[PDB]
Amino acid sequence: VQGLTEEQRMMIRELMDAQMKTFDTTFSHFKNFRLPGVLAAKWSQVRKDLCSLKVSLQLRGEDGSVWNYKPPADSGGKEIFSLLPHMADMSTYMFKGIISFAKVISYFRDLPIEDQISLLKGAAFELCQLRFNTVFNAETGTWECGRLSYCLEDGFQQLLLEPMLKFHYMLKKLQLHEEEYVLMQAISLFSPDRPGVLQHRVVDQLQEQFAITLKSYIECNRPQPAHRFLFLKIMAMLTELRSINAQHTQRLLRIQDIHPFATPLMQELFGITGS
Numbered sequence: 569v570q571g572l573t574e575e576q577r578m579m580i581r582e583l584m585d586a587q588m589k590t591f592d593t594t595f596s597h598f599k600n601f602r603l604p605g606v607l608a609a610k611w612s613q614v615r616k617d618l619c620s621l622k623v624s625l626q627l628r629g630e631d632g633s634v635w636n637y638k639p640p641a642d643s644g645g646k647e648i649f650s651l652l653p654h655m656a657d658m659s660t661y662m663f664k665g666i667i668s669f670a671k672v673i674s675y676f677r678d679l680p681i682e683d684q685i686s687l688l689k690g691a692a693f694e695l696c697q698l699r700f701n702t703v704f705n706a707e708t709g710t711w712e713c714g715r716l717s718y719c720l721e722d723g724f725q726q727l728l729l730e731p732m733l734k735f736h737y738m739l740k741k742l743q744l745h746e747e748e749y750v751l752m753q754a755i756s757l758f759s760p761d762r763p764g765v766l767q768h769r770v771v772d773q774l775q776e777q778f779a780i781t782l783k784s785y786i787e788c789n790r791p792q793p794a795h796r797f798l799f800l801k802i803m804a805m806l807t808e809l810r811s812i813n814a815q816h817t818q819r820l821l822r823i824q825d826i827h828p829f830a831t832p833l834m835q836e837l838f839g840i841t842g843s
């Protein structure tokens with residue numbers, strides 16, 4: 569790109585290299601996942617917690633066959649948990665790609681292992697949502713995950729009330745480059761204020777370099793009036809994503825409390841000990 573320092577161009581490359589190596593955009597290796605079965609104040613809030621992300625699910629076979637699953641309606645029972653096992657498998661698959669992404673980046677390997685763990689615990693969800701946005705189809709409200717499709721159930725303005733859905737639509741509208749998505753991932757990963765981080769100074773210095781690189785990238789490759797304040801818009805979305813992360817963590821722990829579903833990797837990322 570233009571106007572970047574050699575160190576910034578190298579920084580952008582290694583992020584792009586790590587994204588290329590660890591983001592299976594066709595989801596070809598997402599396999600052996602569970603699928604929905606065939607044929608007191610907690611519950612009110614878990615009932616409200618689960619209805620926030622209502623999606624149907626399509627599976628296109630290599631032979632051309634199509635399986636499609638329409639979820640039930642909430643009717644006061646355990647049917648609200650039908651996609652929990654499948655969604656756990658997908659998020660687990662994505663978390664593994666995220667962990668692989670961090671471990672390739674030199675700036676991440678060079679951190680102490682305890683801080684590596686702390687940063688991944690704090691940012692794994694956010695980097696997952698950033699990767700899902702690149703396969704989000706805002707015209708059809710569908711995350712195109714290769715042979716899997718997650719379609720939002722029916723208007724458009726009433727769904728933007730859901731913060732994570734609003735995030736995906738608003739982030740998609742910015743029409744970001746691959747380089748800007750991966751820089752967002754690095755900024756979110758290297759957040760110095762996550763619980764348990766010890767090397768706050770180096771992590772803060774690294775994050776600042778990633779933000780400066782992103783600011784510089786935008787200024788060198790986006791002169792259009794539509795991209796005025798784009799960097800600031802991106803940074804605001806990252807703050808919103810952190811809020812959504814905290815929201816979603818409390819959501820998940822409440823559902824986990826009355827209906828266990830978290831995989832071992834999810835338990836590790838969310839602090840669940842097993843006792």
Ligand SMILES: COc1cccc(N(C)C(=S)Oc2ccc3c(c2)CCCC3)n1
Binds near residue numbers: 696
């Ligand atoms: C109760 O909270 C839960 C339950 C189970 C899994 C999760 N996680 C951690 C994640 S990343 O779920 C998502 C979030 C967004 C999306 C998908 C999964 C799949 C495709 C559509 C976009 N969260």
